[PDB]
Design a protein around this ligand. Structure first.
Ligand SMILES: CCCC(=O)OC[C@H](COP(=O)(O)O[C@@H]1[C@H](O)[C@H](O)[C@@H](OP(=O)(O)O)[C@H](OP(=O)(O)O)[C@H]1O)OC(=O)CCC
Ligand SMILES: *C(=O)CCCCCCCCCCCCC
Length: 131
């Protein structure tokens, strides 16, 4: 149809399903979509970007390099913006982590060139046992 609000009827469905964390018991809710909308405007970023598959991608670009020295305020954003972004990119995740990895994989070439100082340690890989 047309473009309005952040998450439409369909998106709202999957959104409520997605969880803030993989090992948590607090699913996603409108409270998180609005909580970020009010926090975005504070960072000179209009909340209108949250309802755009493009904006969500840009917002993450500024938080990506900020994650290094970002507080709970930053992490929270990257969390919501993540699950939301995936939704707008025709992606269906289960938690905030799954939605995060999907992005890190698309910008894996950029990440490598954005952590020279943080490129002197091991990086163990996580496997999936259950479903
Ligand atoms: C009056 C407040 C207004 C309000 O309702 O604001 C909506 C929320 C903040 O409120 P909250 O939902 O209570 O806070 C969250 C819970 O304690 C959760 O258990 C914890 O997870 P874990 O990582 O510890 O499992 C979250 O991370 P930490 O930052 O604690 O790590 C924490 O933010 O905005 C957000 O930041 C959500 C962004 C996705
Ligand atoms: C226009 O906005 C895009 C159309 C999205 C495809 C529709 C599939 C979702 C099912 C719609 C019915 C929802 C009834 C609550």
């Amino acid at each position: 149809g047309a473009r309005a609000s952040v998450l439409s009827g369909g998106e709202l469905d999957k959104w409520e399903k997605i969880r803030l964390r993989p090992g948590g018991k607090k699913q996603y809710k409108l409270k998180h979509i609005v909580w970020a909308s009010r926090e975005l405007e504070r960072f000179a970023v209009n909340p209108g970007l949250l309802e755009t598959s493009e904006g969500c991608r840009q917002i993450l670009g500024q938080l990506q390099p900020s994650l290094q020295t970002g507080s709970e305020e930053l992490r929270s954003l990257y969390n919501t913006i993540a699950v939301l972004y995936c939704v707008h990119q025709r992606i269906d995740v289960k938690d905030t982590k799954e939605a995060l990895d999907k992005i890190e994989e698309e910008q894996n070439k950029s990440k490598k060139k954005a952590q020279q100082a943080a490129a002197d340690t091991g990086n163990n890989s996580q496997v999936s046992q259950n479903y």
